[PDB]
Structures are given as structure tokens and as C-alpha cells.
């Protein structure tokens, strides 16, 4: 292992500094012996997924907080965790020296790092691009004869995705999302602003747009990349808004229902890509359960929809129980998946706060809340940005777990990296959320899961300043006596057999 080289930028915690020759890393992952637990600890004070071990004991006495595992009580199975290979992320990563690039990719995708198994891939340009383009800009090409991947794909995104997949031990799932169609398919004839596809579902405009998804998947398959899933549209509600500043395509839930039933579903289903999953919504969770009711009560749309993708940006408006909870209750066989999150997109939010513990706690608090309300995965936005939070053609600068400093051939791993890693590293695909009952009222955020192989993982987040002694009971194995320090996050793992 190599420890965090800390650096303060005057925010509440430190970044870890990496460069061509040095990056913090883990030893190969193993379980300790039966009767022993592993603890990984990060703290605002500067600990970064530090490994310690403790005994699992037969007995426990006291009035202190007890968290009892309910291994029998089974909820959702996890798909995974990861981040977005935008044009901006690819430009920032490739601006590093080759050896610094490999340390950045290993930080995310290897077992020496935090084991990402999801990459979100924009279908052509978004705000996190320096050029506005689609795959089919030649006007009125309804045959899509002039469809092609430009260098942003063939020289930047695709070679980096190959390198991430070569570094991973667990299979990586690619998820594709479009921001805009070609402008000649749009009511407003622009990549941005208030605008939808022309005409109506089932017509030439909608058939062309559905065929564009197949052409994209065909083009990535020529480069030997296969997709796990696509979303029906990034933030379809954005294209309903006067003056929307960057690439968008407006759908009402009824429009999305009919597009999916008539065009996108059947076009994917009758293609070599019929196994690729389709996720609906890809938008704020306040739109649930309404959007789920509109699309999924139509059996002709419902038969094509695998999952519901959610964005975190207005989660303050949207209590988990009334949105995620109610959607699961109504449509329990349709998975919920968190497809995009970043801090810094609000006008008052500073783009980049190097070393922000607050932004780390926002990430882990969101992931825990999502996992407690049936969500099967959580996806970061840009994998890497510059110290400005760009590049971004409309200056919609945001924060990222890794900030590249090209003048120093350096990258900074922020608290958000470690907060996400406390989940991504220790919750492999197929892990099943299980119950975890508190003996009393407490200020902690916690979730428990069981690995496919039967091992236990518990994540404990303390967003308070107060240390909280606690015990974890596994009814078949015993008791973990521990503490949750103020401004900490812990991941606990142990064999059950």
C-alpha cells in the first residue's frame, strides 16, 4: 500500500496528491480470518480508507447503541458504482503524462483503487464538451448515411474506456445517455433551448432518433465496446424549459411513454443490441412516482423498460419514501438506479472546493439514502475536471472527485473520491441490501449488505461532530465493538462462514 500524501487548500479537509510516480493505493483485497473484521476509516482530520482489524466476540453487554444485522431480511441487489467519461473528463485525464493517467485510472477501476464497475458515456456533446456536435449533423439525413463517431469518441473516450476495462477485475458496465438529437430532428432547430423531437412518436423523426441509438451502439461495437444499458434521454424535463442553456431534448412523461412503446423499444428489440437494457426518466427523483405511473401502466412501454434512472440535483424537494419508496411499492420488479450526481451546479455553489469534507458527506449521505430505498447503483458525473471545474462550453463548472492540475502533472483525490470508494470498493455487483436495526435513536447514517459469497459489509457515516461508540451484532457470528468518530465514515467487512 501507499498512503495519502495530504495537501490543504484552506477547506475543511485535505486532498490526496498523486502524480507520474506516486499515488495512494491499497494492497490486494482479502477477507481476514473468520472471527475477525476489517474496518476502513476516513476522517475529516485526514485518515483515508485506513485499514484496521478487530475481533468478533461471542457476547455483548451495555445500554449503548446496537445495530443488529438482519441477514434474513433481503432487499435489492446492487448493479454497481462509477462515474462519467465526458469529453471534459477525457481531456483532463489525457492532459496528464501517461504514467499519471494510469495512476488515475487505477485509482478508480483497479482493486489497488476503489473498484468502479460503471462508466456513463454521453451520446455525443453535452455541457462538459468544448465543441457542440452530434453523430449526425449533416442536415435531413433521415437514412443516417452520414452518422459517425468523431475524434472525441475515437481518440479520447473509447481508448480511455478500453484502458479502464483492462485495469478492472470485476466486469465494467457501460451506460449511454444522449443530451441532444441532431438539430434537424428538433422543433427549435438548436442543441439547447426549449425544444422536442418534431412530430409525434411513431413518425419519421422518432424512427430516425430511435435508429440513431442503434447506430451509436453499432459504432461502439466496431471499437469492441458493448453497453449494459442506455437511458431514453438525459434530463428530458430540461428541454421543456425556456432558454435551457445547453444540450437537451424535451419529453413530457407521455411523450417518453409513446417514444419508448412505438420507436425506441421496438428498434432496440429488433436489433443485435436487444440485450441492452433501457432505463427511463434519467431525471430528478421528485418526478417519481408520477413518471413511473405514466410510462409503466402502458403495457406496450412497460415491456421495454428495465429500470428507472434518477439524478440527485433536487433531492432536497423529494423525500426518499414518497418518491423512491412509493415507486418500488408500485413497480417492485423495475429497478431504480442513480445515474448522475455532482456538487457545484447551483449558482451559489463554488465550482471546486479542494478538500471539501462537506461534499464527501453529501456523496455518502446520498448513496446511503439511495441504498435504503431500493436503489441498485450510484453514478458520479465527470470522472475528472480541471481546478476551474471545466472545461465546459457554457461555463457550467462543477466539482469532481479528482481534480487534474496539468501545470504540475498532478491530480488531487478529494473527500468525494473516498466517500464514494467506501461503497464502490466493498459492494460488488450482486451484493444484496439486508436489514440493520438500531436499538435506539441516533445521528448516524448506516446500511448493511451481503456479498454474493455470503460475507457482510456495513457502511457507517457520522455527519455529526460527536463520537458515537456502537456495537454491530451479526446474530450468527457475534459482536463488533467500535466507535463512529465525528466527521468520519467507516466500512466494516467480515466473513460469516
Ligand X SMILES: *[C@@H]1O[C@H](CO)[C@@H](O[C@@H]2O[C@H](CO)[C@@H](O[C@@H]3O[C@H](CO)[C@@H](O)[C@H](O)[C@@H]3O)[C@H](O)[C@H]2NC(C)=O)[C@H](O)[C@H]1NC(C)=O
Ligand Y SMILES: *[C@@H]1O[C@H](CO)[C@@H](O[C@@H]2O[C@H](CO)[C@@H](O)[C@H](O)[C@H]2NC(C)=O)[C@H](O)[C@H]1NC(C)=O
Q: Catalytic site residues?
A: 235, 340
Among 124, 287, 335, 493, binds a second copy (CB under 8 A): 287
Among 75, 259, 313, 331, binds Ca ion (CB under 5 A): 313
Of 243 and 299, which has the nearer Cβ to Ca ion? 243
Residue 52 interaction partner, one of ligand OD0, Ca ion, a second copy, none, beta carbon < 5-8 Å per kind:
ligand OD0
x/- map, 255-294, ligand OD0, by CB under 6 A:
----------------------------------------
Of 73 and 146, which has the nearer Cβ to ligand NAG? 146
The side-by-side arrangement of strands in the sheet containing 15-18 is: 6-7, 15-18, 410-413, 402-405
Q: Nearest approach, Cβ of 176 to Ca ion (angstroms)?
A: 19
- For residue 186, give the DSSP letter: B
Of 138 and 350, which has the nearer Cβ to ligand NAG? 138
Quote the CA–CA distance of 186 and 18 in Å, as a whole number. Answer: 44
441 binding a second copy? (CB under 8 A): no
Q: Nearest approach, Cβ of 52 to ligand OD0 (angstroms)?
A: 4
Residue 126 interaction partner, one of ligand NAG, Na ion, ligand OD0, none, beta carbon < 5-8 Å per kind:
ligand OD0
For residue 100, the surrounding DSSP H or E stretch is: helix 98-109
Quote the CA–CA distance of 81 and 85 in Å, as a whole number. Answer: 13
Quote the CA–CA distance of 484 and 466 in Å, as a whole number. Answer: 9
72 binding a second copy? (CB under 8 A): no
SS3 state of residue 268: helix
In which residue are the cell numbers 495537501 written? Answer: 7
Among 49, 88, 280, 286, binds a second copy (CB under 8 A): 286
Count of residues of this chain found to bind a second copy when the rule CB under 8 A is applied: 25
41 binding ligand OD0? (CB under 6 A): yes
Judged on CB neighbours under 10 Å (0-12, 13-18, 19+), 183 is: middle
393 binding Ca ion? (CB under 5 A): no
For residue 78, is the peptide bond before it cis, meaning its omega torsion is within 30 degrees of 0?
no
Of 53 and 476, which has the nearer Cβ to ligand OD0? 53
Quote the CA–CA distance of 58 and 42 in Å, as a whole number. Answer: 28
485 binding ligand OD0? (CB under 6 A): yes
For residue 445, the surrounding DSSP H or E stretch is: strand 444-450
242 binding a second copy? (CB under 8 A): yes
Among 30, 33, 58, 63, binds ligand Y (CB under 6 A): 58
Residue 59 interaction partner, one of a second copy, ligand Y, ligand OD0, none, beta carbon < 5-8 Å per kind:
ligand Y
- Sequence-distant (6+) residues with CB within 8 A of 207 are 263, 267
146 binding ligand NAG? (CB under 6 A): yes
Quote the CA–CA distance of 234 and 257 in Å, as a whole number. Answer: 15
Of 221 and 438, which has the nearer Cβ to ligand OD0? 438
Count of residues of this chain found to bind ligand OD0 when the rule CB under 6 A is applied: 17
Quote the CA–CA distance of 338 and 360 in Å, as a whole number. Answer: 17
The side-by-side arrangement of strands in the sheet containing 478-484 is: 50-55, 36-43, 488-494, 456-462, 444-450, 432-438, 65-77, 468-474, 478-484
Length of the chain: 497
Provide the binding-site residues for ligand OD0, judged by CB under 6 A. Answer: 39, 41, 52, 126-128, 234-235, 313, 340, 342, 345, 396, 398, 482-483, 485
Provide the binding-site residues for ligand Y, judged by CB under 6 A. Answer: 58-59
Provide the binding-site residues for Ca ion, judged by CB under 5 A. Answer: 313
Provide the binding-site residues for ligand NAG, judged by CB under 6 A. Answer: 138, 145-146
Amino acid at each position: 500500500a501507499r498512503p495519502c500524501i495530504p495537501k490543504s487548500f484552506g477547506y475543511s479537509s485535505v486532498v490526496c496528491v498523486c502524480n507520474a510516480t506516486y499515488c495512494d493505493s491499497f494492497d490486494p483485497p482479502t477477507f481476514p480470518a473468520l472471527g475477525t473484521f476489517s474496518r476502513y476509516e476516513s476522517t475529516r482530520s485526514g485518515r483515508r480508507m485506513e485499514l484496521s482489524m478487530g475481533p468478533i466476540q461471542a457476547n455483548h453487554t451495555g445500554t449503548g447503541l446496537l445495530l443488529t444485522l438482519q441477514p434474513e431480511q433481503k432487499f435489492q441487489k446492487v448493479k454497481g458504482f462509477g462515474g462519467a467519461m465526458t469529453d471534459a473528463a477525457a481531456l483532463n485525464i489525457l492532459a496528464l503524462s501517461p504514467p499519471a493517467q494510469n495512476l488515475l485510472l487505477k485509482s478508480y477501476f483497479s482493486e489497488e483503487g476503489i473498484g468502479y464497475n460503471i462508466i456513463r458515456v454521453p451520446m455525443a456533446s453535452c455541457d462538459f464538451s468544448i465543441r457542440t456536435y452530434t453523430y449526425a449533423d449533416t442536415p435531413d439525413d433521415f437514412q443516417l448515411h452520414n452518422f459517425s463517431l468523431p475524434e472525441e469518441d475515437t481518440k479520447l473516450k473509447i481508448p480511455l474506456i478500453h484502458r479502464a476495462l483492462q485495469l478492472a477485475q470485476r466486469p465494467v458496465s457501460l451506460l449511454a445517455s444522449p443530451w441532444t438529437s441532431p438539430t434537424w430532428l428538433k422543433t427549435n432547430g438548436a442543441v439547447n433551448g426549449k425544444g422536442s423531437l418534431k412530430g409525434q412518436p411513431g413518425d419519421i423523426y422518432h424512427q430516425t432518433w430511435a435508429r440513431y441509438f442503434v447506430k451509436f451502439l453499432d459504432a461502439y461495437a466496431e471499437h469492441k465496446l458493448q453497453f449494459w444499458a442506455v437511458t431514453a434521454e438525459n434530463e428530458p424535463s430540461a428541454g421543456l424549459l425556456s432558454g435551457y442553456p445547453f444540450q437537451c431534448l424535451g419529453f413530457t412523461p407521455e411523450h417518453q411513454r409513446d417514444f419508448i412503446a412505438r420507436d425506441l423499444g421496438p428498434t432496440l428489440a429488433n436489433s443485435t443490441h436487444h440485450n441492452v437494457r433501457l432505463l427511463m426518466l434519467d431525471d430528478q427523483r421528485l418526478l417519481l412516482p408520477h413518471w413511473a405511473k405514466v410510462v409503466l401502466t402502458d403495457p406496450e412501454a412497460a415491456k421495454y423498460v428495465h429500470g428507472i434512472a434518477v439524478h440527485w440535483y433536487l433531492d432536497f424537494l423529494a423525500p426518499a419514501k414518497a418518491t423512491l419508496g412509493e415507486t418500488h411499492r408500485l413497480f417492485p420488479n423495475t429497478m431504480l438506479f442513480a445515474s448522475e450526481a455532482c456538487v457545484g451546479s447551483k449558482f451559489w455553489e463554488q465550482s471546486v472546493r479542494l478538500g471539501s469534507w462537506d461534499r464527501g458527506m453529501q456523496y455518502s449521505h446520498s448513496i446511503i439514502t439511495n441504498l435504503l430505498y431500493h436503489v441498485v447503483g450510484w453514478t458520479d458525473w465527470n470522472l475528472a475536471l480541471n481546478p476551474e471545474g471545466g472545461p465546459n462550453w457554457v461555463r457550467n463548472f462543477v466539482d469532481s472527485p479528482i481534480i487534474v492540475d496539468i501545470t504540475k502533472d498532478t491530480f488531487y483525490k478529494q473527500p468525494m473520491f473516498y466517500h464514494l470508494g467506501h461503497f464502490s470498493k466493498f459492494i460488488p455487483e450482486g451484493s444484496q441490501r439486508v436489514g440493520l436495526v438500531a436499538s435506539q435513536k441516533n445521528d448516524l447514517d448506516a446500511v448493511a449488505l451481503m456479498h454474493p459469497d455470503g460475507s457482510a459489509v456495513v457502511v457507517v457515516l457520522n455527519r455529526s461532530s460527536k463520537d458515537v461508540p456502537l456495537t454491530i451484532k451479526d446474530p450468527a457470528v457475534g459482536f463488533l465493538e467500535t466507535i463512529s468518530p465525528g466527521y468520519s465514515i467507516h466500512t466494516y467487512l467480515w466473513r460469516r462462514q
